[PDB]
Each structure stands twice: as structure tokens, then as C-alpha cells.
Design a protein around this ligand. Structure first.
Ligand code: RB
Ligand code: RB
Ligand code: RB
Lengths: 84, 84, 84, 84
């Protein structure tokens, strides 16, 4: 469902934010965004106060969306695929 | 619902704790609190034993509250907004 | 419920393991155990292969228990307390 | 259920990927895979762009599976075992 598009837009947004503000290469910016929203958290934190502030809000807004997608992918695509 | 206020009070509490005990700038203290309670965990750990102890309890008490909020925000605000 | 005791036994176990095997001070060992099982993950990883192996199994066994507790604490203690 | 096998295949896959691409010792590769898919995230991130890209997809595909397993283990094996 739209979940796929909403997640991609969210990651694009994060990728744009962290390339600009934190000065990261897109792939690193997208990486950061992904591991942050999935709560994995394996990179170091944002160095700038604006990066911190954004990440805070990005987490509260982005996580439900990203885990809604991961959820539907699982019990909606992966489950029946496996069961075959 | 009250979830919004309870979460903010919890983050204020964490922000006060980590500024005092760990000696962090508020924004860093609030950052720590947020990434801890959301289980992202991208900063280094608390350096003081009191920081450790507090974080342990702060996690067990704070996480259910913070994820209750993130949950209601998603399936209560974000979902219908998207569906428009 | 027993959840409280099961969680404490699990943390005691982790505290004993990581003091011995990784050579950590109890409080650090307990800290590690807690942030690992809550999936926060803010310390560095175990340095020993036995620490790695144990952590893998400790995560698969411990997490459901620890989040069962955090869950009951929330929708069973915190929720009605707040609603007062 | 198959969950056990699907999880092991997923970790084997991650173990193979990270030994090859990132140049890690199997046990380290498997460790990385496990803490990534459980969202603990305590090691440093992948250093290679291919490691980053793979991890992104590995997270979206692997997490639902790994947490489906952890879930069934809990409310299906651990719960009744405890209740005895
Ligand atoms: Rb996490
Ligand atoms: Rb994490
Ligand atoms: Rb982490």
C-alpha cells in the first residue's frame, strides 16, 4: 500500500536533511536515516544541534510509518510467500 | 491524549537528570533521553554509575509511555492524515 | 506477575556472565545486559567470542521476557496510575 | 515452526555477506547480523557502500522474520515453560 511510498518519501527527506545539515554523502545520509527510524542506531549521533533537533522529531514522526511498512511487508507479503 | 504531556514530562525529567549528573548541554541531554527511550541508542553510554542506574530505571519506566505515544500518534493521527 | 522475578533473574544472569567473561564491574555488566535486552545498544559490543555467542542467545531468549515485563508494567500499572 | 529455519537462513546469509564484503570473521559477521536484525545496533556501522546498501535491505526484509521468531518463542515456548 501507500506505506511503500510514504516510507521512501521519509527516507528521501532524511537523506536530504543529513546530506545538507550534517554534510554527509547521500548514501551515508540515507543509511543514517534508515538505522535511526528502525531504531538500530549503529552510527554515531548527529554532531549539529539542528541535526539533533531534527532527528528527535524525525524519530517520533518517522518510526510509526517505517514500522507500519515493515509490519505490512511481514504479515502480508513475507508470510504467504514463505508458506508456499 | 495525556500521552503527549506524559512524554514531554519524561523528556524534561531526562533532560534535567543528564544535564546535572552527566554534565551535558540540555540539547544533548534531551537528545540522549530521546534516543534512549526510543531504543535507538546511537550515543555513547552514561559515564557515571548514577547515570547508568538512572538510565536502567528510566528505560523500564519511560519506554512504555514513549511508545504508547508514538503508537497513538501513528494509528490515530498519521494514518487518517495520510488517508486524505 | 512472575515477569518481575523472571526479568531480575535474567539481568542477574547477564550481570554474572559479563563480569566474569568480559571482565566488567557488576554495574557495567548489568548495564550492558539491560541496554542489550531492551535493544537500546549504546555501549560497544562484547570483545570476546564467548561474549558474542552468549549475547546472541541471551538476546533471542531474554528480549521476549524483558519486553513482556515492560509491556505489563505499561498496560497494567502505568496506565491506570496515570488515569487518576 | 519454519520461523526457526527462516531465521537461521537469514543469519547464515548475513554471516556470508559480512565476512565477504566487510571482511569480518564469521563470528563477528554473524554477530553483526544478529544485533542489526534485533535492532540492538551496538557495533559500528558497515564501512563499505555495499555493506550499507545491503544492511538497509537486510533490515527491512530480515527484521519482521527475526521478530516473528522471537515472538513465537516467547508466547509459545517461554510462557508455558515458565508457567510450570
Ligand atoms: Rb532498538
Ligand atoms: Rb538500538
Ligand atoms: Rb544502538
Amino acid at each position: 500500500q501507500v506505506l511503500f511510498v510514504l516510507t521512501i518519501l521519509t527516507l528521501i527527506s532524511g537523506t536530504i536533511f543529513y546530506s545538507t545539515v550534517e554534510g554527509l554523502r547521500p548514501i551515508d545520509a540515507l543509511y543514517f536515516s534508515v538505522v535511526t527510524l528502525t531504531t538500530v542506531g549503529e552510527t554515531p549521533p548527529p554532531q549539529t544541534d539542528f541535526g539533533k533537533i531534527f532527528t528527535i522529531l524525525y524519530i517520533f514522526i518517522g518510526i510509526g510509518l517505517v514500522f507500519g511498512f515493515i509490519h505490512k511487508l511481514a504479515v502480508n507479503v513475507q508470510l504467504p510467500s514463505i508458506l508456499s
